[PDB]
């Protein structure tokens, strides 16, 4: 299970780091796409992608590195790639899953769950979980609003794999 770490800066001030662990063996294509975007060796990645939609106590979203407004995003496989499976479910807080606009519409956007989401099962592919920095996740969550607009501007300054 490959590990992913992000450096989060809010209002130009670093606030902490969040570490994710991916279910590569269960969801290969999604993990590979996420790994490629995080590494940034292809000339593009999550560097500079803000959290454009954070709903407190519900979910965090991000990964828009082309427009920074929730409309952009792509994938190593192209504009979109088909789904794989739902062997994992939104059963625990902090699960990392892909955000899409329907079947086979997966891209670069992702969302992190803060509470169980049984209703989201069978719709979004879960491919990771938070292993460290959960305190930073809560700190980022506290800055959200019910409408999803963040009180402060939060941007992922750096991303990498470990």
């Amino acid at each position: 299970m490959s590990q992913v770490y992000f450096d989060v800066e809010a209002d130009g001030q670093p606030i902490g780091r969040v570490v994710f662990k991916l279910y590569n063996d269960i969801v290969p294509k999604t993990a590979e796409n996420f790994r490629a975007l995080c590494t940034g060796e292809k000339g593009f990645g999550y560097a500079g992608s803000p959290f454009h939609r954070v709903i407190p106590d519900f979910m965090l979203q991000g990964g828009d590195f082309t427009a920074g407004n929730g409309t952009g995003g792509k994938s190593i496989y192209g504009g979109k790639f088909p789904d794989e499976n739902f062997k994992k479910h939104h059963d625990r807080p902090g699960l990392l899953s892909m955000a899409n606009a329907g079947p086979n519409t997966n891209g670069s956007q992702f969302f992190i769950t803060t509470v169980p989401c049984p209703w989201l099962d069978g719709k979004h592919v879960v491919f990771g979980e938070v292993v460290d920095g959960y305190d930073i996740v809560k700190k980022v969550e506290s800055l959200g609003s019910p409408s999803g607009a963040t009180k402060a501007r939060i941007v992922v300054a750096k991303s990498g794999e470990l």
Partner: protein, 726 residues
Amino acid sequence: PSKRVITIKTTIKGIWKYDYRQPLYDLVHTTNLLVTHTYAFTKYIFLKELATDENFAFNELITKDFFVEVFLSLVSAKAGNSERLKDTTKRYRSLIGKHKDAYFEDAKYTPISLAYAQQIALYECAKVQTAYFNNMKAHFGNRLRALINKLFKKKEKVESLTKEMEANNFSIKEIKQAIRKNVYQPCNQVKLAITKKNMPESGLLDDKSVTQLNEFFSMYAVDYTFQKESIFYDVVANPEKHFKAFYKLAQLSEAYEVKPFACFPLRRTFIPCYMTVDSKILNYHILKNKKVLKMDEKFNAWGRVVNLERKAFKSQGCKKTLHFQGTLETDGVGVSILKQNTDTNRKYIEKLEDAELKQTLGKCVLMDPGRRDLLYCMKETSRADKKEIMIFTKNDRSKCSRHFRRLRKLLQPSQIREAETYLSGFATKSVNMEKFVEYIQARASVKDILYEYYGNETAKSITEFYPESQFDFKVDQKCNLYYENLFVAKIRGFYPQPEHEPNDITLKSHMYHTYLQIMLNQKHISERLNSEKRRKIEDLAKAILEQPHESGHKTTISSLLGKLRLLPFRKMKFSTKLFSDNNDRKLVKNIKKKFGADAVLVLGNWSAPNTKYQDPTRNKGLRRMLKKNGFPLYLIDEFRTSSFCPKCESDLEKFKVIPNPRPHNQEKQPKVLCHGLLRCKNMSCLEQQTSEGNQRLWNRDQAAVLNFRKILNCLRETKQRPPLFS
């Protein structure tokens, strides 16, 4: 060597420098009006002279010089030397001035100051003369024949004779012969006599018809004789001496309550039209230069407004022998770049030969052109268990055109539709003086508003067509954000959501701000908003963030953004051409891939005539396009091809009754007989199932292509058409 001209389409925004965009827009707004007034003014002069004195020289005034003088009469300028004017020019100007003052008050038009308008007048008037010649050449004989039939009272005589013979219980054999002897043949003789300018035999026409014929002949010179003893041929060969007669023909047709037809071309469309942009026109009107532009600097001047390094402007064609000569056409949105290679200095498949028919084995594809289905293509190798069938429907081609038409009819402001309805009540094509004057006054009453609405793309918009209207965002299934009708973008991360409909309604206002940020960042949306409105919208957005619960901010934003709701008609027109080209290439791709690269096409002889309740269809231009692409195309007769069962050659019939396929006619008629379905009457045709009895069912197109294959096989074997299909 020979000469040819090719055109390449593009857009103003893609090649035109921003600094010089505004001068071009004003020029089109000026040229379009001047051309429109030129058409109306020219017709007004003719109807004034012809309605007051029948001894007028209308025939002699159809020349480019006269139109140029009419066009220039609407432009205010500092007159030059007066003694250098030709006698013809002085006479034309005097004639124009005879009604210039009256027309301006009638049309409520004011002269427009436009220096260096000589070239614009020459090109626009040259088109005007071309339109005048083409209009009469195409329909002179066609309308003359209709008038002769009306004068002969062919309809009345046929009805009277038919009903008289019905009382005698005569059969169709006798009726169709008596009518031919007593109606058709005498009418043909009358037409032949008129064709040579000689009156027909006395007694064949009533006194009124004879008097009208004498009046019609008085238009021509008494001693003048039609060339080759044929009025129809003479008009085509020498139309210069028939314009006055054509007007008299139109007047007679109107007098007989015939459908009015436009004898004098008129530009009724309010949307700006394409205009030529010559090097001189660019030098003076656009570049605002004030000195002569020599041919050597022609390219240099052009490069100052457009990029000549683009592939569109560079050479094109085989051997790169076609060059851009600094001439193009534009309507303010679209651009047509012309290229020329010269200086500016002034077979049915049955009749195929053995060497051809016998070499097409295994490569013939049969196409049946339908009405709702444009093409039904079947490969000769098709079988029941191997369906090599392709259907090209009308919906595929008309997808974009129908979509634009639906959008336009929905976004039309209430004022615009009312103005259009009021304007449409006047018969423009009528030649009557009073009716034409009324139309001019009606058009001039709302000309400004119509031009402003249709000119919203470039002309400054000061009037708002959507007052007291509130707009809001919405999202469809595909996560496409629509602002009433505007397409903002696709929200690829919209599915993840909590339980729907939170109790806090005010959160929706905050979502509006997010949508606004997703909209104001769009290129096509930002470019359409001026700086002042954008600043106000941003200020309102900030207020909404501070005070989401206030709906006044949203109402103000919607009112400010009401400008974007205006449709770019010219862009839609340009998109229609692109969609048609793409579909044509789309059809070519399907033909090459579905069947084969070197497939041979067989097409029916049906001409697809235009008829009421049946929109146009691709029958004539399709053949040109297919032959241009290089597909060997041949024609095959359709005589009784779909009237027999392919399985056993038995007659077919329609049996299913279906609700009216046209939904708007369902109210008028509950059900109608089926169109494209047939069954075989013969009971031995099918290996019928037990206890119910059954027959094979066929599609009309499917049966036709199968019968086409039978004819093709018979021709290959013996080169003789089957007796059944002959």
